[PDB]
Amino acid sequence: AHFPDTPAFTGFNAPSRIECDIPNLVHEGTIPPELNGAFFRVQPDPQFPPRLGDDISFNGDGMITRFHIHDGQCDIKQRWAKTNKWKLENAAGKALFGSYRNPLTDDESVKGEYRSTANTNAFVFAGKLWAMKEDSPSLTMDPATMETFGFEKFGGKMTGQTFTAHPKVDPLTGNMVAIGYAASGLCTDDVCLYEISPDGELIYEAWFKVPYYCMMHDFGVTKDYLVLHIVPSIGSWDRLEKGLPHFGFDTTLPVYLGIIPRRADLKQEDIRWFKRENCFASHVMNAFQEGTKVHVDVPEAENNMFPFFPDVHGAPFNPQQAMSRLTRWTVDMASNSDEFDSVTRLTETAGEFPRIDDRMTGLPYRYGWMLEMDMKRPVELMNCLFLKDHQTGAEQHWWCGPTSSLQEPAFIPRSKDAPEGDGWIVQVCNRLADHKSDLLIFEALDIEKGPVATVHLPFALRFGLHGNWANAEEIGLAA
Amino acid sequence: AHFPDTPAFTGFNAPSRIECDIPNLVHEGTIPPELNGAFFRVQPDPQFPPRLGDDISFNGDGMITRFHIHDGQCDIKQRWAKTNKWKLENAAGKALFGSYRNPLTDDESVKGEYRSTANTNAFVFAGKLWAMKEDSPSLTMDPATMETFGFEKFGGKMTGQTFTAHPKVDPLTGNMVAIGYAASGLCTDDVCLYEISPDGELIYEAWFKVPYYCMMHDFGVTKDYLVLHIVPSIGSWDRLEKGLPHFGFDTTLPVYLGIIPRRADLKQEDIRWFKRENCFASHVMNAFQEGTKVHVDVPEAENNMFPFFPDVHGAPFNPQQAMSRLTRWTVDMASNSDEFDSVTRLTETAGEFPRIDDRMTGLPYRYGWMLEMDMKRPVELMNCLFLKDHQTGAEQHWWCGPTSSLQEPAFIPRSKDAPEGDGWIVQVCNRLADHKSDLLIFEALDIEKGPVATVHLPFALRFGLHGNWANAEEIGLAA
Numbered sequence: 001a002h003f004p005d006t007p008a009f010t011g012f013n014a015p016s017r018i019e020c021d022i023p024n025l026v027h028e029g030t031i032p033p034e035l036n037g038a039f040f041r042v043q044p045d046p047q048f049p050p051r052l053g054d055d056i057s058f059n060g061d062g063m064i065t066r067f068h069i070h071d072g073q074c075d076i077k078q079r080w081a082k083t084n085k086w087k088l089e090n091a092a093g094k095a096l097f098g099s100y101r102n103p104l105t106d107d108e109s110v111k112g113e114y115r116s117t118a119n120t121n122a123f124v125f126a127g128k129l130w131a132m133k134e135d136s137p138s139l140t141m142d143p144a145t146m147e148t149f150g151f152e153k154f155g156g157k158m159t160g161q162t163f164t165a166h167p168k169v170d171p172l173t174g175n176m177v178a179i180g181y182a183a184s185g186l187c188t189d190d191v192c193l194y195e196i197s198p199d200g201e202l203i204y205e206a207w208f209k210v211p212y213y214c215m216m217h218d219f220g221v222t223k224d225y226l227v228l229h230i231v232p233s234i235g236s237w238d239r240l241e242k243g244l245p246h247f248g249f250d251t252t253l254p255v256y257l258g259i260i261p262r263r264a265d266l267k268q269e270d271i272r273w274f275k276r277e278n279c280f281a282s283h284v285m286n287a288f289q290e291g292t293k294v295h296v297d298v299p300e301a302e303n304n305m306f307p308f309f310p311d312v313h314g315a316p317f318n319p320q321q322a323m324s325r326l327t328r329w330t331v332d333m334a335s336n337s338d339e340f341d342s343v344t345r346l347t348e349t350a351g352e353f354p355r356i357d358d359r360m361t362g363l364p365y366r367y368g369w370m371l372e373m374d375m376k377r378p379v380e381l382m383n384c385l386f387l388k389d390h391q392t393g394a395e396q397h398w399w400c401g402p403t404s405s406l407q408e409p410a411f412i413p414r415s416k417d418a419p420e421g422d423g424w425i426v427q428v429c430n431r432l433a434d435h436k437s438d439l440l441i442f443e444a445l446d447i448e449k450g451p452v453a454t455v456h457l458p459f460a461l462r463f464g465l466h467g468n469w470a471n472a473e474e475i476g477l478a479a
Numbered sequence: 480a481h482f483p484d485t486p487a488f489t490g491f492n493a494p495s496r497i498e499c500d501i502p503n504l505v506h507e508g509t510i511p512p513e514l515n516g517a518f519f520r521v522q523p524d525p526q527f528p529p530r531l532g533d534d535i536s537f538n539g540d541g542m543i544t545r546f547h548i549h550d551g552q553c554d555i556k557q558r559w560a561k562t563n564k565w566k567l568e569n570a571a572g573k574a575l576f577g578s579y580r581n582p583l584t585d586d587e588s589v590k591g592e593y594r595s596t597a598n599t600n601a602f603v604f605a606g607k608l609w610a611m612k613e614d615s616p617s618l619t620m621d622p623a624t625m626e627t628f629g630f631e632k633f634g635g636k637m638t639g640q641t642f643t644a645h646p647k648v649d650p651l652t653g654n655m656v657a658i659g660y661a662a663s664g665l666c667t668d669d670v671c672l673y674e675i676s677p678d679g680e681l682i683y684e685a686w687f688k689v690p691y692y693c694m695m696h697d698f699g700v701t702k703d704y705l706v707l708h709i710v711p712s713i714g715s716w717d718r719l720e721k722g723l724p725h726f727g728f729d730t731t732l733p734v735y736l737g738i739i740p741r742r743a744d745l746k747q748e749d750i751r752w753f754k755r756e757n758c759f760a761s762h763v764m765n766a767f768q769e770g771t772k773v774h775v776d777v778p779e780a781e782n783n784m785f786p787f788f789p790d791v792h793g794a795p796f797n798p799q800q801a802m803s804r805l806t807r808w809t810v811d812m813a814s815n816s817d818e819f820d821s822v823t824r825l826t827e828t829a830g831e832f833p834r835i836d837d838r839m840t841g842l843p844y845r846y847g848w849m850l851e852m853d854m855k856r857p858v859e860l861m862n863c864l865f866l867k868d869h870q871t872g873a874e875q876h877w878w879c880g881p882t883s884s885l886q887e888p889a890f891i892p893r894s895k896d897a898p899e900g901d902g903w904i905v906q907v908c909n910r911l912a913d914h915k916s917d918l919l920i921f922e923a924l925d926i927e928k929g930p931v932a933t934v935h936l937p938f939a940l941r942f943g944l945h946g947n948w949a950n951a952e953e954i955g956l957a958a
């Protein structure tokens with residue numbers, strides 16, 4: 001393959017496209033014998049050179065990595081998420097779909113097809129592996145064989161066009177809670193709220209509209225509510241016609257937080273929109289209710305965090321204003337005005353990729369993990385694992401050293417009934433000087449002493465998005 | 480896996496154990512559209528940590544790499560050679576066989592089993608892939624699927640215990656010509672000569688004895704003769720009982736060159752042994768006849784080339800005396816004495832891994848390729864590809880640069896009837912600074928301008944031994 005000599009395809013961003021199997025990877029330390037399950041994660045990884053001769057990182061085909069941990073050892077299985085895009089281009093031996101979220105650049109032979117790369121999350125639910133991309137229904141796969149099933153449209157009961165890559169699981173019911181924005185077509189202001197039973201059946205789909213079309217990448221879920229931030233990374237057909245990146249950031253637009261009842265009978269009039277001054281937030285650590293208030297914790301930045309989705313008025317990217325810090329947004333459903341109740345920074349540590357013990361989804365919670373960027377460390381990057389204790393305020397930091405960087409952590413509970421945070425953190429470490437990757441295993445509430453096990457991969461993973469642990473019994477692997 | 484922190488298992492020698500598939504590898508330059516076939520090579524690569532807690536490179540399990548070149552692109556498929564050793568240890572989840580060529584260190588549960596790692600050659604013949612190790616019958620595999628068949632004992636017609644890893648193909652008949660030393664048991668002085676028909680049937684096996692048991696790793700073949708150098712890298716049960724490496728080098732023993740008729744009715748009395756002063760040679764570029772003389776070209780060194788098979792009188796390893804140079808050994812079957820007719824250095828370039836256009840096996844020939852060690856180059860190693868022209872004396876050199884090293888080249892003929900050397904060279908390049916490997920493609924008689932195509936692998940291969948090209952129609956791949 002002749003790939004472009006551009007930053008998105010060279011160095012750490014060289015295409016990999018490895019499908020492989022390796023049991024019993026070389027490792028150091030002690031892998032807890034308690035661990036019996038697998039960590040799934042996804043990397044964008046282009047099957048083919050881009051039609052245009054350049055592209056962005058968020059547009060690579062989804063490649064799924066599975067780390068099966070059992071019997072004190074770690075195995076790897078890596079396979080493509082075989083989206084319709086993947087299959088069609090594989091059959092043709094060439095790229096057919098074009099630029100990011102831009103159907104005007106597709107070959108005529110794939111007009112109307114799902115454009116999903118399934119490259120944003122590798123999520124386990126209802127016995128399936130979900131390879132997810134927010135512009136289409138989710139792909140599903142067999143978590144044991146990692147063969148691909150296809151797109152999940154829930155027996156035709158789903159009528160929206162799209163499905164999130166940030167599903168939540170409500171610990172009260174076991175339901176998956178999801179959204180799908182641009183639900184009636186590209187750049188539309190329609191959004192669907194979905195709930196899926198533990199057995200994988202669509203319970204309900206509820207339609208509503210948002211103040212403006214924008215990237216609705218993540219969201220919060222509480223017992224009663226969908227908690228949906230409206231942040232002006234906006235797109236339009238006009239932008240696509242002019243050859244601009246689909247999304248650009250508009251610093252002049254307000255930010256909203258919508259509180260949307262989790263009800264099949266939802267009507268537009270039931271929704272409250274709170275309004276604040278322009279800022280940027282993408283991910284949600286957790287949301288929860290307190291009396292008539294709703295709290296949601298997000299990494300907040302002063303300005304755009306996506307340089308490839310540039311300022312719509314032509315401003316150059318500002319890295320300092322892109323530094324995000326975990327911040328609590330609080331709104332009161334009983335308040336008279338549309339103002340937030342408060343906006344409270346929770347740490348001065350800069351970071352992203354927030355995570356919790358997902359058994360606390362929608363509930364008051366004590367622990368949050370993040371990828372931290374400590375700019376005071378030597379670099380010879382997201383260079384630390386960070387743990388915040390909301391009860392005491394205490395913070396822990398683990399630095400990966402001066403030639404490495406880190407990927408998103410994922411929490412592994414010790415048992416169904418264990419206390420919050422009782423378990424382990426796993427995360428990929430980019431050993432940049434060695435052009436390889438490690439999988440790190442930490443004791444989840446004692447990270448400053450470093451990982452208790454380091455699993456070496458004999459090759460490099462690419463930049464990853466989201467990932468999740470599932471116990472073996474949930475994914476068809478051995479007891 | 481917990482592997483030792485010793486040189487044989489760290490750095491460039493870290494275990495890899497990657498089984499993978501990647502079509503359409505990232506590449507630069509132009510892959511000749513004429514190419515339609517595959518290059519097979521083997522790396523020792525330990526499935527399990529060694530029982531003793533250390534080991535040598537030559538004892539790693541064989542991992543087979545296939546580079547399928549077609550339609551201007553290059554694909555990789557990599558799979559284990561599933562020897563009985565591999566299967567038994569895989570079933571047990573642990574190492575069962577011990578030190579190199581030392582059955583005294585094996586677990587009692589595998590006494591008497593073939594100890595082969597199939598780690599020295601990946602050879603194509605009679606529609607099969609041969610994964611070869613000189614202490615056992617060859618393993619065979621499907622060259623298209625790279626599944627393993629098992630050990631080849633030719634329907635019981637082979638009674639020797641062992642089969643070489645340096646088979647030759649006689650261009651006159653298409654027969655595979657092979658030896659097997661220690662043919663009646665470890666450290667015995669019996670050797671078998673084998674010829675195999677193009678259809679894979681054993682034609683004959685002929686037994687003889689050698690002046691002393693030693694590592695008979697390679698050999699030459701001419702129309703009339705097996706050409707067998709006797710070089711005193713010797714082994715013994717006594718050495719094994721004392722915990723020494725199987726082989727050690729004895730500088731006080733003579734070197735012999737045996738000329739053995741290629742005849743099923745061979746008797747010991749038919750053999751001529753020529754004798755010379757102590758030296759070291761392992762590999763054979765080619766051998767051929769001229770009148771009543773026999774010529775064989777070998778990389779000759781003054782002393783031992785294997786530091787892990789040390790001097791038997793305790794001398795420290797001497798790297799300068801290990802530097803080998805292509806040298807022609809000439810004997811005359813009509814000579815009265817046992818002296819060589821001549822010993823003639825053919826180049827002052829130091830090198831190993833000699834190769835030819837294998838259509839010239841056993842014939843007078845013009846071209847020879849080698850891996851060269853140019854110690855005058857900056858190193859920031861086997862660092863050059865070398866081509867010798869025996870007709871004009873001319874030499875070509877291509878340097879891989881100051882952070883790389885090279886593996887064995889292999890010649891690809893343009894067509895069955897093309898002139899000698901008309902075709903391409905392929906070889907793996909170790910990009911040590913990048914911790915990855917490339918496959919290089921050269922125009923075989925024009926190497927100084929560098930490769931015409933560079934195929935990037937997104938991971939590192941380990942040190943390799945021998946490899947071979949086969950056209951697609953010989954290995955069940957597409958026309």
Ligand SMILES: COc1cc(C=O)ccc1O
Nearest residue numbers: 044058059119120217465
């Ligand atoms: C990996 O692809 C995407 C990632 C994100 C946020 O991290 C937003 C949109 C994408 O398409």
Ligand SMILES: COc1cc(C=O)ccc1O
Nearest residue numbers: 523537538598599696944
């Ligand atoms: C890769 O294993 C071997 C290699 C050699 C010579 O290169 C001799 C004996 C072996 O077992």
Ligand SMILES: [Co+2]
Nearest residue numbers: 202203204264
């Ligand atoms: Co219903």
Ligand SMILES: [Co+2]
Nearest residue numbers: 217218283466
């Ligand atoms: Co995300």
Ligand SMILES: [Co+2]
Nearest residue numbers: 681682683743
């Ligand atoms: Co016969």
Ligand SMILES: [Co+2]
Nearest residue numbers: 696697762945
């Ligand atoms: Co050899």
Ligand SMILES: [Mg+2]
Nearest residue numbers: 154155200201
């Ligand atoms: Mg269904």
Ligand SMILES: [Mg+2]
Nearest residue numbers: 278279302303
């Ligand atoms: Mg501002």
Ligand SMILES: [Mg+2]
Nearest residue numbers: 633634679680
């Ligand atoms: Mg047979």
Ligand SMILES: [Mg+2]
Nearest residue numbers: 757758781782
């Ligand atoms: Mg001498």
